[PDB]
From a paper:
Like GroEL, human mHsp60 can also assemble into stacked back-to-back double-heptameric rings capped by a dome-shaped heptameric mHsp10 (GroES in the case of E. coli) co-chaperonin lid to form ATP-driven nanocages for a substrate–protein to fold in confinement. Features shared by all three structures include mHsp60 protomers in an extended conformation along the molecular symmetry axis with clearly defined domains, namely an equatorial ATP-binding domain (residues 1–137, 411–526), an intermediate hinge domain (residues 138–191, 375–411), and an apical domain (residues 192–374). Each mHsp10 protomer adopts the canonical seven-strand β-barrel structure and exposes a flexible loop sequence of twenty residues (mobile loop) that mediates the interaction with helices H and I of the mHsp60 apical domains.
Independently of the football complexes, we also determined a 3.83 Å resolution C7 symmetry 3D reconstruction of the half-football complexes observed in this data set (EMD-9196). The same ADP-bound nucleotide state is found in the half-football (stage V). The differences between the ADP football and half-football are quite small (RMSD ~0.5 Å), and indicate that these structures are essentially the same, saving for the quaternary structure difference (football vs. half-football). However, all the nucleotide-binding sites in our football and half-football WT mHsp60–mHsp10 structures were occupied by ADP, indicating that under our specimen preparation conditions ATP hydrolysis had occurred rapidly. The structures of the ADP footballs and half-footballs provide potential evidence for a second level of structural dynamics along the reaction cycle, namely the inter-ring split of mHsp60–mHsp10 football complexes. We also provided structural details of half-football complexes, and experimental evidence suggesting that active single- and double-ring mHsp60 complexes coexist in the reaction cycle of the human mHsp60–mHsp10 chaperonin system.
Author numbering:
A (entry chain E): 177 to 352
B (entry chain D), C (entry chain G): 265 to 352
D (entry chain S), E (entry chain T), F (entry chain R), G (entry chain U), H (entry chain O): 3 to 102
Amino acid sequence: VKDGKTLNDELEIIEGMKFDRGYISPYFINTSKGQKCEFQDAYVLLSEKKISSIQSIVPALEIANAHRKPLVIIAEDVDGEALSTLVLNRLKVGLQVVAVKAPGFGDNRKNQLKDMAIATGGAVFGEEGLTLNLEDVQPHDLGKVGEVIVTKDDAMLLKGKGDKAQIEKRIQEIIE
Amino acid sequence: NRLKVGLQVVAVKAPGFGDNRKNQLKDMAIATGGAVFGEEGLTLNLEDVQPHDLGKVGEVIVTKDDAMLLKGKGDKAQIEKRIQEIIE
Amino acid sequence: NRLKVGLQVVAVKAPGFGDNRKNQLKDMAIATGGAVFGEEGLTLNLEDVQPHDLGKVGEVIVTKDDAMLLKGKGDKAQIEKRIQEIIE
Amino acid sequence: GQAFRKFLPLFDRVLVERSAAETVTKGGIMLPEKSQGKVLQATVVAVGSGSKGKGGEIQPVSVKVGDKVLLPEYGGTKVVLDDKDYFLFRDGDILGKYVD
Amino acid sequence: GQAFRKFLPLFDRVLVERSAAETVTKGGIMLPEKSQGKVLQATVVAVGSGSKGKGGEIQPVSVKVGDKVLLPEYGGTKVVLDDKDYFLFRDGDILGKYVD
Amino acid sequence: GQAFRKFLPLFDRVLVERSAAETVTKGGIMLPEKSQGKVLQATVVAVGSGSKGKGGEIQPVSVKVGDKVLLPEYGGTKVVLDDKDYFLFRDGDILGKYVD
Amino acid sequence: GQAFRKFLPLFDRVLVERSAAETVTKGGIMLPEKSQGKVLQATVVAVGSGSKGKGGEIQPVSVKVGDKVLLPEYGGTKVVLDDKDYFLFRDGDILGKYVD
Amino acid sequence: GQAFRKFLPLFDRVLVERSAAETVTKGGIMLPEKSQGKVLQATVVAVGSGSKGKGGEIQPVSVKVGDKVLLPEYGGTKVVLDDKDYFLFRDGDILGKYVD
């Protein structure tokens, strides 16, 4: 429960994978609405580390543009230079993309991104143990979800195709 | 160029702020009709400006402590769409 | 050399003071019979030591916090003269 | 040594010109200008007379005009001709020659 | 001086290429990539024309293409051909030649 | 080696003089003096005797008086003759020659 | 210029190997490994071709393989062959030759 | 080039040995060891082969063994033979020769 704001009570159901963090650049605003970015069937990129170099960000956008589908970028943080590339390809021709930082604050974010990847179906990037360098990503290496919406101060993932048996096993892990 | 021959010019800074200042400069450009310079995403370098790339207004008056733009020809449909954006 | 072949050795610092420790080391040397090393007045470098240049005692026992020297063969007339010095 | 639009280097120099800036990627993305450094593949536009530093007779410059070369990184003088900036390097500084 | 895919060094240079990265150990363990530095055993892919710095007649480059050499540590220029990074060293800089 | 108003350089030197300051722009604006640096296109007024550093016989200076050259940036001695400041450079330091 | 297990130095180099570590003393005491530095008496295992830097004809390396020499303190670079670390020095850097 | 107890310098070197430490004064006082520096008058014990750096033929070392010389101050290598420390200098470094 939270401190209400209206005359009456309210029962809200936060469904999907949603979190308090908003889209970084206000150039992805394709909603024609209150600061939203709406994508349908978009790919996902999931890096545990930041995204600084243009060489790092470039192949993901290459794969996305080849498939011609919108892309979400859930990572630690976006370089101003890769951000500049993004805004360049967004203001003009308009490669459907969007940038958001990591939801979890600390150690929690590592588990949260792992769960997000396994929910959407894919693989976290920036790993320590295998480390999954961004230079060699693959069309089955991206997070895939039915629908994504981003506000300036939260975003939601919907229909992540993440191997329901696998997410089941993850659930069993965390429940034990 | 002003004291002698007298190229009619005038210098004024921006309103002064962060995000609101950038939005206000954008709105000023779209109101007068033109394009903001110093952008991040397209960045519109000053070296290559064009006669249709300038802000154009009927009259401008500057005091020591405020200034006024009057007749910005800024694509009234476009400024309308901007208004709809900020009102939503 | 201790964990392997088993040289018999032991390490202990000085008593720990200022000039008093130097005097006590001198007295220890003259008691056991030998020459203090690290001197200022006469250098007595360790590189050239001699079998009659070592302190020799009957028995030595060391704890974690103190040690005891026993039967220092230090020229009893010489230690007597030392005693006379310090008593005067 | 061969010259250019009223310009000629001196005894060691090689005036050349970088290639384009390579804005877009190969496949489908485009890159900004603040990135991508300075294109290190260049073409030689004019050549100095020759290395007079050689004892007695002077030494002719090897890389002939019209060649694609692998530029060095730091050494070089930015000169302007007709508001076209060219780069003047030293003959010993050129890395590779794109022979084909 | 022998060339490569539209490339040729200049007067001293030796374009070569390190060997593989040596991920796994000999016996049964495997190593990551952030370790293991850069493999210092390399093979020469292209060779410069020759040392023109020799008085009068120029000096031919000794290490011929197709040789396994013991690279130096720091000196060297990272060049790219077809997105294949090769290293251009100087003829005096090569340490050893794996003759066999 | 040719001289000037009771002046002559020594063995390597080239006394020259920058061109004008280029106050106004090309089209319609005029620039101040604190900007615009120092005009790097110059004309040679006097020339040294020649490079005696050449073994045995000395080496004559190449760039002859009356030439428009591309000055270097830093190296150079500001000398005064009749309160007319000229710049004395070194023969190896001249970048380009405006041949036409 | 003589070689080793698929290795050969270049033009100046002398691959050699230090002697043992000298653990125990002469008489009756044994020393650790962190002390005792690096044994400066070594034997030459392979020798470079020769000093090509000599004008015209190149200069043969003097110290022949199989010699005990007095190593310099910092000269030479570590190298590995078969996990056996040898040290490659420069011909001018060897201090003394243990002739006998 | 003459040798010592299974030792021989290389091409420029001169192994020598300082004289005594000069403990007592001339008249009646004696000095400690921490003072008195290092006795700069020495005798040459072994001599290098000769200066090969001389063009073509090598250059013989001048100071012959058995001479009293005025040592330099800093340049020199402390070498040990039979636990007898000798100093190896360079032929150009010897200051004076005590001829008599």
